[PDB]
Coordinates of C-alpha atoms in Angstrom, one line a residue:
Chain Z
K1 CA 113.2 62.9 69.7
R2 CA 113.1 64.4 66.2
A3 CA 114.6 67.5 64.9
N4 CA 112.5 67.8 61.8
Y5 CA 106.9 73.4 63.6
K6 CA 109.3 74.5 66.2
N7 CA 109.6 78.5 67.0
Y8 CA 109.9 77.2 70.7
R9 CA 111.9 79.6 73.2
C10 CA 111.2 78.0 76.6
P11 CA 108.3 77.9 79.3
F12 CA 110.6 78.3 82.2
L13 CA 114.1 79.4 83.4
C14 CA 116.7 76.7 83.4
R15 CA 118.7 77.8 86.3
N16 CA 115.4 77.6 88.2
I17 CA 115.2 73.7 88.1
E18 CA 119.0 73.0 89.0
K19 CA 119.3 69.7 90.9
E20 CA 120.8 66.7 89.1
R21 CA 123.3 64.9 87.4
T22 CA 122.2 62.5 84.9
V23 CA 118.6 62.9 83.0
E24 CA 117.1 59.7 84.3
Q25 CA 118.0 60.6 87.8
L26 CA 116.0 64.2 86.8
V27 CA 113.2 62.1 85.6
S28 CA 113.3 59.7 89.0
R29 CA 113.2 63.1 91.2
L30 CA 109.9 64.3 89.4
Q31 CA 108.7 60.9 90.1
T32 CA 109.4 61.1 93.6
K33 CA 108.1 64.7 93.9
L34 CA 104.9 63.7 92.6
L35 CA 104.4 60.4 94.8
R36 CA 105.1 62.2 98.1
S37 CA 103.0 65.3 97.2
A38 CA 100.7 67.1 99.4
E39 CA 98.0 67.4 97.0
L40 CA 97.2 66.8 93.6
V41 CA 94.2 67.4 91.5
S42 CA 93.6 67.5 87.7
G43 CA 90.3 68.3 87.0
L44 CA 91.0 70.5 84.2
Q45 CA 89.8 69.7 80.6
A46 CA 89.8 71.7 77.2
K47 CA 89.1 71.0 73.7
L48 CA 90.3 72.1 70.4
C49 CA 89.3 74.6 67.9
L50 CA 88.8 73.1 64.5
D51 CA 91.0 74.7 62.1
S52 CA 91.7 77.4 64.6
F53 CA 94.1 75.4 66.8
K54 CA 93.5 77.1 70.2
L55 CA 92.7 75.3 73.4
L56 CA 89.1 75.8 74.8
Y57 CA 88.9 75.3 78.6
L58 CA 85.6 74.1 79.6
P59 CA 84.3 76.2 82.4
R60 CA 84.1 75.1 86.5
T61 CA 87.2 72.7 85.9
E62 CA 90.6 73.3 87.5
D63 CA 93.9 71.7 88.2
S64 CA 95.8 71.8 91.4
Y65 CA 99.4 70.8 92.5
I66 CA 100.7 71.4 96.1
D67 CA 104.2 70.0 97.1
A68 CA 105.0 68.5 100.8
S69 CA 107.2 71.3 101.8
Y70 CA 104.8 74.1 101.2
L71 CA 102.5 73.3 104.4
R72 CA 106.1 72.8 106.3
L73 CA 107.2 76.6 105.8
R74 CA 107.8 78.4 108.8
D75 CA 107.6 82.2 109.1
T76 CA 110.1 83.2 111.5
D77 CA 113.3 82.9 109.3
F78 CA 111.2 83.4 106.0
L79 CA 110.8 87.2 106.2
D80 CA 114.1 87.2 108.6
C81 CA 116.1 85.8 105.9
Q82 CA 114.8 86.8 102.8
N83 CA 113.5 90.4 103.7
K84 CA 116.5 91.4 105.6
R85 CA 119.1 90.2 103.4
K86 CA 117.1 91.8 100.4
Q87 CA 116.4 95.2 102.0
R88 CA 120.1 95.6 103.3
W89 CA 121.7 94.8 100.1
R90 CA 119.2 96.8 98.1
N91 CA 119.8 99.9 100.4
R92 CA 123.7 99.1 99.9
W93 CA 123.2 99.0 96.0
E94 CA 120.9 102.1 96.0
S95 CA 123.5 104.2 97.5
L96 CA 126.2 103.0 95.5
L97 CA 124.3 103.2 92.2
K98 CA 123.0 107.0 93.4
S99 CA 126.5 108.5 92.9
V100 CA 126.8 108.6 89.3
Chain L
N1 CA 101.3 77.5 62.3
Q2 CA 102.2 78.9 65.7
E3 CA 99.3 77.6 68.0
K4 CA 100.5 74.0 68.0
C5 CA 104.0 75.5 69.0
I6 CA 102.3 77.2 72.2
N7 CA 100.4 74.0 72.7
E8 CA 103.6 72.1 73.0
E9 CA 105.3 74.5 75.3
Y10 CA 102.3 74.5 77.7
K11 CA 102.6 70.9 77.7
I12 CA 106.5 71.1 78.8
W13 CA 105.5 73.9 81.2
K14 CA 103.0 71.6 82.8
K15 CA 105.1 68.6 83.1
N16 CA 107.8 70.5 84.4
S17 CA 106.0 72.6 87.0
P18 CA 106.3 70.4 90.0
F19 CA 109.9 71.7 89.9
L20 CA 109.0 75.6 89.7
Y21 CA 106.0 76.0 91.8
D22 CA 105.4 74.9 95.5
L23 CA 101.6 75.8 94.9
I24 CA 99.5 76.4 91.4
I25 CA 96.0 76.4 91.0
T26 CA 94.1 77.2 87.5
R27 CA 90.6 77.4 87.9
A28 CA 89.2 77.8 84.3
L29 CA 86.8 80.6 84.0
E30 CA 83.5 81.4 82.1
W31 CA 84.6 84.5 80.6
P32 CA 87.5 86.9 79.7
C33 CA 88.8 88.8 83.0
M34 CA 90.2 92.4 82.8
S35 CA 90.9 93.5 86.5
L36 CA 91.9 92.2 89.6
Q37 CA 92.7 92.9 93.5
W38 CA 92.6 91.1 96.5
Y39 CA 90.7 91.7 99.8
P40 CA 93.0 93.3 102.3
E41 CA 92.6 90.9 105.3
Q42 CA 91.3 87.1 105.5
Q43 CA 88.7 85.1 107.5
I44 CA 90.4 82.0 108.6
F45 CA 89.3 78.4 109.8
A46 CA 92.0 77.4 112.2
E47 CA 90.9 73.7 112.8
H48 CA 90.1 73.6 109.2
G49 CA 93.0 74.9 107.8
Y50 CA 91.6 76.1 104.5
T51 CA 91.4 80.0 105.3
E52 CA 89.3 82.3 102.9
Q53 CA 90.8 84.8 100.6
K54 CA 88.3 87.1 98.2
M55 CA 89.2 89.4 95.3
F56 CA 86.7 91.5 93.2
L57 CA 87.4 90.9 89.4
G58 CA 85.8 91.9 86.2
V59 CA 84.6 90.1 83.1
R60 CA 83.5 90.8 79.4
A61 CA 80.9 88.3 79.2
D62 CA 80.0 89.3 75.5
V63 CA 80.8 92.1 73.2
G64 CA 79.3 95.2 75.0
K65 CA 77.9 93.1 77.9
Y66 CA 80.2 93.5 80.7
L67 CA 79.9 92.2 84.6
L68 CA 81.5 92.3 87.9
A69 CA 82.3 89.4 90.2
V70 CA 83.9 88.4 93.5
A71 CA 85.7 85.2 94.0
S72 CA 86.6 83.0 96.8
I73 CA 89.7 81.1 97.3
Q74 CA 90.5 78.2 99.8
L75 CA 94.4 78.7 100.6
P76 CA 95.8 76.6 103.3
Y77 CA 96.3 78.1 106.8
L78 CA 100.4 77.3 107.2
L79 CA 91.5 74.1 97.1
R80 CA 89.1 75.4 94.6
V81 CA 88.4 79.1 93.4
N82 CA 84.5 79.7 93.7
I83 CA 82.9 82.4 92.1
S84 CA 80.5 84.4 94.6
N85 CA 77.8 86.9 93.6
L86 CA 77.9 88.7 90.2
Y87 CA 76.7 92.1 89.5
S88 CA 76.0 92.8 85.6
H89 CA 78.0 96.2 85.3
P90 CA 76.0 98.7 82.9
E91 CA 78.8 99.6 80.9
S92 CA 82.6 98.6 80.3
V93 CA 85.1 98.1 83.0
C94 CA 88.7 98.4 82.8
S95 CA 89.6 99.8 86.1
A96 CA 87.6 98.1 89.0
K97 CA 89.7 98.8 91.9
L98 CA 88.4 99.2 95.5
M99 CA 89.6 101.7 97.9
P100 CA 91.5 100.8 100.9
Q101 CA 89.7 103.4 103.4
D102 CA 86.8 100.6 103.2
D103 CA 86.5 97.6 101.2
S104 CA 82.9 98.3 99.7
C105 CA 83.5 101.4 97.8
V106 CA 83.9 101.1 93.9
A107 CA 84.9 103.0 91.0
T108 CA 85.0 101.9 87.7
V109 CA 85.8 103.2 84.0
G110 CA 84.9 101.6 80.5
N111 CA 87.2 101.8 77.6
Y112 CA 84.3 103.2 75.5
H113 CA 82.4 105.5 77.7
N114 CA 83.6 108.8 78.5
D115 CA 82.5 109.1 82.0
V116 CA 83.7 107.4 85.2
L117 CA 81.0 105.7 87.3
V118 CA 81.5 105.4 91.1
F119 CA 79.7 102.8 93.2
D120 CA 79.0 102.1 96.9
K121 CA 77.3 99.8 99.3
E122 CA 73.9 101.3 98.4
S123 CA 74.1 100.4 94.9
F124 CA 75.0 97.1 96.2
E125 CA 72.3 96.3 98.3
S126 CA 69.8 98.2 96.0
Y127 CA 70.7 95.7 93.1
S128 CA 67.5 93.5 92.9
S129 CA 68.7 90.1 91.6
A130 CA 66.3 90.9 88.2
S131 CA 67.7 94.1 86.7
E132 CA 66.2 94.1 83.5
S133 CA 67.9 97.1 83.4
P134 CA 71.6 97.1 84.7
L135 CA 73.2 98.2 87.9
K136 CA 72.4 101.6 89.3
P137 CA 75.7 103.7 89.6
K138 CA 76.0 105.2 92.9
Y139 CA 76.9 108.4 90.8
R140 CA 78.6 109.2 87.4
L141 CA 81.3 111.7 86.9
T142 CA 81.2 113.4 83.3
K143 CA 83.6 116.0 82.4
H144 CA 86.2 114.5 79.7
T145 CA 85.6 114.2 76.0
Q146 CA 86.6 110.6 75.0
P147 CA 87.1 107.7 76.9
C148 CA 89.3 107.3 79.8
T149 CA 92.2 105.1 80.7
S150 CA 92.9 104.3 84.5
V151 CA 92.1 105.3 88.0
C152 CA 93.5 105.3 91.6
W153 CA 92.1 106.2 94.9
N154 CA 93.9 108.1 97.7
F155 CA 96.0 106.8 100.4
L156 CA 96.0 109.2 103.3
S157 CA 93.0 111.5 102.9
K158 CA 89.8 109.8 101.9
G159 CA 87.8 111.1 98.7
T160 CA 89.5 112.0 95.6
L161 CA 89.9 110.2 92.3
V162 CA 92.4 111.1 89.5
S163 CA 91.9 109.9 86.2
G164 CA 93.3 110.2 82.4
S165 CA 91.0 110.3 79.6
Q166 CA 91.8 110.2 75.8
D167 CA 92.2 114.1 75.8
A168 CA 95.7 113.7 77.1
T169 CA 94.7 115.8 80.3
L170 CA 94.3 114.4 83.9
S171 CA 91.4 115.6 86.3
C172 CA 91.0 114.8 89.9
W173 CA 87.6 115.0 91.4
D174 CA 86.7 115.0 95.2
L175 CA 83.6 112.8 96.3
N176 CA 83.2 114.2 99.9
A177 CA 82.2 117.5 97.9
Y178 CA 79.5 115.9 95.5
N179 CA 76.3 117.4 95.2
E180 CA 74.1 116.3 92.4
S181 CA 72.4 120.4 92.3
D182 CA 76.0 121.1 91.0
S183 CA 77.8 118.7 89.4
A184 CA 80.6 121.0 88.2
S185 CA 82.1 121.5 91.5
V186 CA 83.1 117.6 91.9
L187 CA 86.5 118.6 89.7
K188 CA 88.9 119.2 92.7
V189 CA 91.4 120.3 89.5
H190 CA 92.2 119.2 86.2
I191 CA 95.9 119.3 84.7
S192 CA 96.8 120.0 81.1
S193 CA 100.6 118.9 80.3
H194 CA 100.5 116.1 77.9
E195 CA 99.6 116.1 74.2
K196 CA 98.5 112.9 73.2
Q197 CA 96.8 109.5 74.7
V198 CA 97.5 109.3 78.4
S199 CA 97.7 105.9 79.4
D200 CA 98.6 105.7 82.9
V201 CA 98.4 107.7 86.2
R202 CA 98.9 106.8 89.9
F203 CA 98.9 108.2 93.4
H204 CA 101.6 108.0 96.1
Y205 CA 101.7 106.1 99.2
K206 CA 103.3 108.3 101.5
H207 CA 101.6 110.8 99.1
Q208 CA 104.4 113.3 99.9
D209 CA 102.6 116.0 98.0
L210 CA 102.7 113.9 95.1
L211 CA 101.0 112.2 92.2
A212 CA 102.4 110.8 88.7
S213 CA 101.5 109.8 85.0
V214 CA 102.7 109.2 81.7
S215 CA 101.2 109.1 78.1
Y216 CA 102.1 108.3 74.3
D217 CA 104.1 111.3 74.0
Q218 CA 107.1 109.5 75.7
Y219 CA 107.1 111.5 78.9
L220 CA 106.8 111.2 82.6
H221 CA 105.2 113.9 84.6
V222 CA 105.1 114.1 88.1
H223 CA 103.0 117.0 89.7
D224 CA 102.1 118.5 92.9
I225 CA 98.3 119.7 93.6
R226 CA 99.3 122.1 96.2
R227 CA 100.8 124.5 93.8
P228 CA 98.7 126.9 91.9
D229 CA 99.8 126.6 88.4
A230 CA 100.0 122.9 88.4
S231 CA 97.4 122.5 85.9
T232 CA 99.2 124.0 82.6
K233 CA 102.9 122.8 83.2
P234 CA 103.8 120.0 85.6
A235 CA 106.8 120.1 88.1
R236 CA 108.7 117.4 86.4
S237 CA 108.1 116.3 82.9
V238 CA 111.3 113.9 82.4
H239 CA 111.6 112.3 78.6
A240 CA 112.7 109.1 80.1
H241 CA 111.4 106.3 77.3
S242 CA 111.6 105.6 73.7
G243 CA 108.1 104.0 73.0
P244 CA 104.8 104.4 74.1
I245 CA 105.0 104.4 78.0
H246 CA 102.4 101.6 79.5
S247 CA 102.5 101.8 83.2
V248 CA 103.9 103.3 86.4
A249 CA 104.3 101.4 89.8
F250 CA 105.6 103.3 93.0
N251 CA 107.2 101.5 96.0
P252 CA 105.2 100.6 99.1
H253 CA 108.2 100.9 101.5
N254 CA 110.9 103.6 100.3
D255 CA 109.0 106.8 98.9
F256 CA 111.7 107.6 96.5
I257 CA 112.0 104.6 94.0
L258 CA 109.8 104.9 90.9
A259 CA 109.5 102.3 87.9
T260 CA 108.0 103.0 84.3
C261 CA 107.6 100.8 81.2
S262 CA 107.3 101.2 77.5
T263 CA 107.4 99.0 74.2
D264 CA 111.4 99.4 74.7
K265 CA 111.0 96.1 76.4
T266 CA 112.8 97.7 79.0
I267 CA 111.5 98.8 82.1
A268 CA 113.3 101.5 83.6
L269 CA 113.7 102.4 87.4
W270 CA 113.8 105.7 88.5
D271 CA 114.9 107.6 91.6
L272 CA 113.0 111.0 92.5
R273 CA 115.9 112.8 94.3
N274 CA 117.6 113.3 90.9
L275 CA 115.3 112.4 88.3
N276 CA 117.3 113.0 85.1
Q277 CA 118.9 109.7 84.3
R278 CA 117.6 106.3 84.5
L279 CA 119.4 104.3 87.5
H280 CA 119.5 101.0 86.0
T281 CA 117.3 100.0 82.3
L282 CA 116.1 96.5 82.9
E283 CA 116.0 93.8 80.2
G284 CA 115.0 90.5 79.6
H285 CA 111.6 90.8 77.8
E286 CA 111.1 90.1 74.2
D287 CA 107.8 91.8 73.4
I288 CA 105.9 94.5 74.6
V289 CA 105.5 95.0 78.3
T290 CA 102.4 96.2 79.8
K291 CA 102.0 95.5 83.4
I292 CA 104.6 96.5 86.2
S293 CA 103.8 96.0 89.9
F294 CA 105.9 96.1 92.9
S295 CA 105.7 93.8 95.9
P296 CA 103.8 94.9 99.0
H297 CA 105.9 92.5 100.9
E298 CA 109.4 93.3 99.7
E299 CA 111.4 96.5 98.7
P300 CA 112.9 95.8 95.3
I301 CA 110.6 92.5 94.1
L302 CA 109.3 93.9 90.9
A303 CA 107.3 91.9 88.6
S304 CA 106.5 92.7 84.7
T305 CA 104.1 91.3 82.2
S306 CA 104.3 91.5 78.7
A307 CA 103.3 90.3 75.1
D308 CA 105.6 87.7 75.0
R309 CA 103.2 85.9 77.3
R310 CA 105.6 85.6 80.2
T311 CA 105.7 87.0 83.7
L312 CA 109.3 88.2 85.0
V313 CA 109.9 88.4 88.9
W314 CA 113.0 90.5 89.5
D315 CA 115.3 90.8 92.2
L316 CA 116.5 94.7 91.9
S317 CA 119.2 93.9 94.5
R318 CA 121.4 91.7 92.4
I319 CA 122.3 94.4 90.0
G320 CA 125.7 93.7 89.1
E321 CA 126.7 90.4 90.7
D322 CA 129.4 87.8 90.2
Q323 CA 127.4 84.9 88.4
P324 CA 128.9 81.9 86.6
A325 CA 129.2 81.9 82.7
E326 CA 127.2 78.9 82.4
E327 CA 124.0 80.6 83.6
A328 CA 124.4 83.7 82.1
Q329 CA 122.7 82.8 78.9
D330 CA 119.2 82.9 80.5
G331 CA 119.5 86.6 80.8
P332 CA 120.8 89.3 83.3
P333 CA 121.4 88.5 87.2
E334 CA 118.2 90.5 87.9
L335 CA 116.0 88.3 86.3
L336 CA 114.6 86.0 89.3
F337 CA 111.9 84.0 88.0
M338 CA 109.5 83.6 84.7
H339 CA 106.2 82.2 84.7
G340 CA 104.9 80.9 81.2
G341 CA 101.9 78.9 82.0
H342 CA 99.6 81.1 79.8
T343 CA 98.8 79.7 76.4
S344 CA 97.4 83.4 76.1
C345 CA 98.6 86.8 77.1
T346 CA 98.0 88.0 80.9
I347 CA 95.7 90.6 81.1
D348 CA 96.0 91.6 84.9
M349 CA 98.3 90.1 87.6
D350 CA 98.1 90.9 91.4
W351 CA 100.2 90.1 94.5
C352 CA 98.2 88.7 97.3
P353 CA 98.8 91.0 100.4
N354 CA 98.4 88.5 102.9
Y355 CA 100.7 85.3 101.6
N356 CA 104.4 85.6 100.9
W357 CA 105.4 85.0 97.5
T358 CA 101.9 84.2 96.0
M359 CA 100.5 86.0 92.9
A360 CA 97.2 85.9 90.7
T361 CA 97.5 86.1 87.0
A362 CA 94.3 86.3 84.8
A363 CA 94.8 85.1 81.1
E364 CA 92.9 86.0 78.0
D365 CA 91.8 82.4 77.3
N366 CA 89.4 82.2 80.4
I367 CA 92.1 81.3 83.0
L368 CA 93.2 82.7 86.2
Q369 CA 96.1 81.1 88.1
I370 CA 97.4 81.4 91.6
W371 CA 101.0 80.4 91.9
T372 CA 103.9 80.4 94.2
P373 CA 107.4 80.1 93.3
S374 CA 109.6 77.2 94.9
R375 CA 111.4 78.1 98.1
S376 CA 114.7 76.9 96.2
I377 CA 114.3 80.2 94.2
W378 CA 113.6 82.9 96.6
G379 CA 115.2 81.1 99.6
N380 CA 119.1 81.0 100.4
Chain O
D1 CA 116.1 37.3 99.7
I2 CA 114.2 35.8 96.9
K3 CA 112.7 39.5 96.5
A4 CA 116.5 40.9 96.8
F5 CA 117.1 38.5 93.8
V6 CA 114.2 40.2 91.8
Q7 CA 115.5 43.6 92.6
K8 CA 119.1 43.1 91.4
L9 CA 117.6 41.3 88.3
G10 CA 115.3 44.3 87.7
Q11 CA 118.2 46.7 88.2
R12 CA 120.8 44.8 85.9
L13 CA 118.2 44.3 83.5
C14 CA 116.6 47.7 83.6
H15 CA 117.5 48.8 80.0
Chain S
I1 CA 76.9 39.7 53.8
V2 CA 78.2 43.2 54.1
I3 CA 78.1 44.6 57.6
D4 CA 76.3 47.7 58.9
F5 CA 92.0 67.1 76.7
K6 CA 91.7 66.4 80.3
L7 CA 95.3 67.9 80.2
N8 CA 96.6 65.6 82.8
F9 CA 100.1 64.9 82.8
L10 CA 101.1 64.9 86.1
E11 CA 98.1 62.3 86.8
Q12 CA 99.7 60.2 84.1
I13 CA 103.2 60.0 85.3
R14 CA 101.8 59.1 88.7
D15 CA 99.7 56.3 86.7
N16 CA 102.7 54.9 85.3
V17 CA 105.0 54.8 88.5
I18 CA 102.3 53.0 90.4
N19 CA 101.5 50.8 87.9
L20 CA 105.1 49.7 87.5
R21 CA 105.4 49.2 91.3
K22 CA 102.2 46.9 90.7
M23 CA 103.9 44.5 88.4
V24 CA 107.3 44.5 90.3
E25 CA 105.3 43.4 93.2
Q26 CA 103.4 40.7 91.1
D27 CA 106.5 39.0 89.8
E28 CA 108.2 39.4 93.1
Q29 CA 105.4 37.1 94.4
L30 CA 105.6 34.8 91.8
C31 CA 109.2 33.7 92.2
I32 CA 108.5 33.6 95.9
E33 CA 106.1 30.8 95.6
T34 CA 108.1 29.1 92.6
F35 CA 111.5 29.2 94.0
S36 CA 110.5 27.2 97.1
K37 CA 109.3 24.4 95.1

């Protein structure tokens, strides 16, 4: 890179993408996540506004990615695990939090 | 000086997405969007897979020239977003929201016009596709003095409409008693409690003799319409905020939890059994927070949106967990997901009521995204 | 094997 | 004499990966025919 413009904060939350050890292994994981994709479309285009450097997305154009596991999700332990764990822990923390 | 920075952030976000989302669709639109709501149930195509969803949005095609539109989404039955018929609304629209009892009734209010416009299926069928003059409202209701802010329908007894105008006073109409010979009998009641701009008002799902509203006078007022003197001083008037409040969101499952939100960058979650001190002030936003919506699939999963151009999905269950010091830099343990694929500020977001963990966020630069966080984030 | 030679050569000389 | 956007980064990454595998197969077939002579 360089370090010479930048009021960057971040797009995303670095906790969310936690897998890997090196950084070239991170890049390899992205590549094999794109090659084995279940859908990948990149119609979306845009254009730059002169002397007002904003993007102008030309209409009717869209982009769409879908990963392979998305179509492999079962809705039996989906709500079972997520919703049951969540609601029980939430009732517990609500009963405890409402004693002050 | 700041726009190319935002473009770099968008490029980084777009290159990183195959990590955060298991589905994300960005269909560039034709006009800015200012409202959103999904149609309740869905027509499915089993052998075809691409089940069809619909949602009714508004637009601001040009200055003063608004519109209304319906869109159709192509989600797979475990994919473009096609615009359907337009409607060319006569005035502004910032509260176009269909009622649950039937998926055809409409109520809209503009940011500049001082009266609510209620529409019905007859107004839709009567709409000829020439309309040199705009659509014909099923009827208008005019009692306020200055423009109104937000609307919401009943959820237990069909026919009434609560609204907060610029005169700092609420007014609830009843539509089943509407008669054009006497348009002054549509006022079920009107409440005079707040002093400055009332910016939001909502109803209750168990309705448990309830209603709620906020304002810019730093107050949260919950009323009870069954009371005789409920028009001058409400039932509860808690002064629980620092800046102008922006929204309110009841909870679908548990009828006690509430949550408010102001420019304090801190949505404050509330309990109605003892409404004197906030249960746990949330933080994580770095500018004015406008939208706060709960999940109609889980109890604590809240979502908020702000002027920092990010959508924060929370998990209220984790208030006070044992997390490692490596990850405690990103923010509290409540913060569960952040969406920042918007080069503009999202104007309205909404959860889809049929698919789990799906949301639709309408940007301001003519964008509308449908996204689902990864399983590795809400799973275990 | 003449295709394993090429993979070994391409990983030893990858940088 | 004198003389008289598409914003596709995922597609670009996929492009590059498949091109690289193309090249690898190319030389993998070159050495197959050369090394037997």
